[PDB]
Structure formats: structure tokens, C-alpha cells
Amino acid sequence: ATGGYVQQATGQASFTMYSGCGSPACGKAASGFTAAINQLAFGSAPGLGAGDACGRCFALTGNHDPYSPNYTGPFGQTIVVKVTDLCPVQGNQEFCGQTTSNPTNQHGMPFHFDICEDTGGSAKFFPSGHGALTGTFTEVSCSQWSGSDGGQLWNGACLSGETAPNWPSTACGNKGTAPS
Ligand SMILES: OC[C@H]1O[C@@H](O[C@H]2[C@H](O)[C@@H](O)[C@H](O[C@H]3[C@H](O)[C@@H](O)[C@H](O[C@H]4[C@H](O)[C@@H](O)[C@H](O[C@H]5[C@H](O)[C@@H](O)[C@@H](O)O[C@@H]5CO)O[C@@H]4CO)O[C@@H]3CO)O[C@@H]2CO)[C@H](O)[C@@H](O)[C@@H]1O
Ligand SMILES: OC[C@H]1O[C@@H](O[C@H]2[C@H](O)[C@@H](O)[C@H](O[C@H]3[C@H](O)[C@@H](O)[C@H](O[C@H]4[C@H](O)[C@@H](O)[C@H](O[C@H]5[C@H](O)[C@@H](O)[C@H](O)O[C@@H]5CO)O[C@@H]4CO)O[C@@H]3CO)O[C@@H]2CO)[C@H](O)[C@@H](O)[C@@H]1O
DSSP: OTTSOOOOSEEEEEEEEESOOSSOTTSOOBSSOEEEEEHHHHTSOTTSOOOTTTTOEEEEEEEEOTTOTTOOOOOOOOEEEEEEEEEOSTTOTTTSOOOSSSOSOTTSOSEEEEEETTTTHHHHHSOTTOOOEEEEEEEEOGGGOOOOBOOOSSTTOOOGGGGSOSSSOOSSOOOSOOOO
16 A cells, blocks of 8 residues: 555454553544554554554454464454554564565464453453454454544544555555555
8 A cells, every 4th residue: 555555355364352442543542452563564654643453443363373273273253352552663573573575473464353351242252361363354344333422632633444445545644654
């Protein structure tokens, strides 16, 4: 997409959980299940505000525990998240370090979703004792997502991807250039 970001509506991803998604990089939180997405897909960099992932909804499915490859299941439920946040390259080299020159992370995944624990998404997705997975995602209509957006936290905040057709398309728009 514009900026060199790798923004595909479906693919393979890794998955983790995180705490504290109430003041996220898109500039609005939401009450439903939410995630951060890796920088190369988010469409912005730290401090630059919303990227084009903001507000888009994705169905996530885990099917592998990369730390325990002998585990065959059960996995969690498929969940629908709204992307509200950025998982930056900086400080997240294992999972969110995809760049235009090296577009997969240390698990070979071209995307990563960090699922917010606060609002319940991670408890639906991660079995007890298996807090990091790999699997698939596919962008869906936000008709498939339960929840309500929070208020703007700063000027330029954006979740307009929530009413956009799936990628390829533009809603909030990308900021600057993807990490190289
Ligand atoms: O940077 C992105 C994001 O990260 C968030 O933290 C992540 C973190 O990055 C990730 O490394 C971490 O991964 C955990 C994982 O959650 C956990 O399930 C896994 O547990 C393993 C355990 O280490 C193994 O020892 C055990 O092996 C057993 C075998 O399963 C069994 O068959 C037998 O052989 O016995 C073995 C030994 O007991 O299996 C467990 C399950 O696979 O360990 C991983 C590495 O620590 O997950 C976290 C949370 O998602 C972070 O919160 C966020 O802020 C950040 O943005
Ligand atoms: O008034 C001056 C100027 O302001 C502009 O608006 C600014 C606003 O002032 C800033 O506060 C705001 O800052 C946001 C950053 O742009 C955004 O990148 C950052 O995103 C964070 C996110 O908050 C955080 O949750 C996330 O953590 C991840 C890490 O991987 C781990 O720490 C965690 O465990 O897991 C998560 C997910 O993986 O990190 C990201 C990236 O660091 O959030 C900031 C606060 O929301 O930027 C605004 C835009 O520049 C205003 O537009 C101008 O008009 C005005 O002049």
C-alpha cells in the first residue's frame, strides 16, 4: 500500500496477548475485542498516529503453538478483533519486526496480532498454558464485531477502517514509509 506497508486482507500471522489497550496508537480504544497489529501492516510508526489498519476487523484463528510444536490442540475459538493499536518493530523483534526488506518475523509470519487481554479477547483465543500461537487471519465486515468505540484521545484519532471495504482500500490512510 501507500508507504510500502504490507496490508493484506488475509494471510498467516502469529499471535500474542498484551495488557493496557485503553490509549492505543489509533487514538480511540474500543470496548469489544481489540488487537495491535505489527508496524509493517499497521501503516504508521510510533508517534505518527493512526495507520490504515485502524478500525478494520479481522477473524483470527490459532492452529499451532510454536513453542510447543508437539501440541495438537485444543486451540481457542476464532475471534473477531478490531485493530486499534500498533505493535512496533522497536522492542518487539521476535513478533513484530517485519520490514520491507525482511517481511517475516522470527516465526516466519508476515503479520502479527497482539490481542488485548483487558477486554476479553485473549481469554477466548488462547488456551490456558498456551499464550502465543500461529495461524490465520481474514478481514471481515465489522458487522461481525461486537463492541463500541471509545472517544477520540487526540486530534487525528481514527478508526474509520471500521466502515471500509477490505484491503485493498483506504480509510484512515498510512503515515510515512514502512520500516525497511
Ligand atoms: O512482543 C509482542 C508482545 O509479547 C507479549 O508477550 C508474549 C511473548 O512475546 C511471548 O514470547 C510469550 O510466549 C510464551 C507463551 O505465551 C507460553 O505459552 C509459552 O509457554 C511454553 C513454555 O515456555 C514451555 O516450557 C512449555 O513446554 C512444555 C511442553 O509444552 C510439554 O510438551 C513438555 O515438553 O513440557 C514442556 C516444558 O514444560 O510449553 C509452554 C506452552 O507452549 O512460553 C512462551 C515463551 O515465554 O507470550 C507472551 C504473551 O503473549 C507481551 O505481553 C506484549 O506486551 C508484547 O507486545
Ligand atoms: O499536541 C501535539 C500533537 O499531538 C498529535 O497527536 C498525537 C498525540 O499527542 C500523541 O499522544 C499520540 O501518541 C500515540 C502514538 O502516535 C502511537 O504511536 C502510540 O502507540 C503505542 C500504543 O499506545 C501502545 O499501546 C503500543 O504498545 C504496544 C507494544 O508492543 C507494547 O508496549 C505493548 O505491550 O503491546 C502494544 C501492542 O503491541 O505501542 C504503540 C506504539 O508505541 O500511542 C500514542 C498514544 O495514543 O500521537 C498523536 C499523533 O501524532 C496531534 O495529532 C497534533 O495535532 C498535535 O499537534
